[PDB]
From a paper:
BsCspB is a relatively small protein of 67 amino acids length that belongs to the cold shock protein family.
The overall thermodynamic stability determined for 4-19F-Trp-BsCspB is highest comparing all variants probed in the present study and deviates in ΔG° by 1.6 kJ/mol from wild type BsCspB. This property of 4-19F-Trp-BsCspB has been one rationale to elucidate the structural features of this fluorine-labelled variant of BsCspB by using X-ray crystallography in more detail. The fluorescence emission intensity is lowest for 4-19F-Trp-BsCspB among all probed fluorine-labelled protein variants. To investigate potential structural changes in 4-19F-Trp-BsCspB and 4-19F-Phe-BsCspB, we have elucidated their atomic structures using X-ray crystallography to 2.05 Å and 2.1 Å resolution, respectively. The samples crystallized in a closely related crystallographic lattice, containing one single molecular copy of modified BsCspB in the asymmetric unit and sharing a same space group symmetry.
Residue numbers in the entry: 1 to 67
């Protein structure tokens, strides 16, 4: 897994970006968010995740919020 920080997220629209030092930022859609409750994220949140790339390019997957 990769580790990152939520750079920003639009709760109403349900997407945003994960910052990772070193690599480019990673687009994250709310469907990638793991766990219970309403799928959303806050700026600066610690997350673990994977990058998945199909014909639309890379985006986050398997996003878990961490302490």
């Amino acid at each position: 897994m990769l580790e990152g920080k939520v750079k920003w997220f639009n709760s109403e629209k349900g997407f945003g970006f994960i910052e990772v030092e070193g690599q480019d930022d990673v687009f994250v859609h709310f469907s990638a968010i793991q766990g219970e409750g309403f799928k959303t994220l806050e700026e600066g949140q610690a997350v673990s995740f994977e990058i998945v790339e199909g014909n639309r390019g890379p985006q986050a997957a398997n996003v878990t919020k961490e302490a």
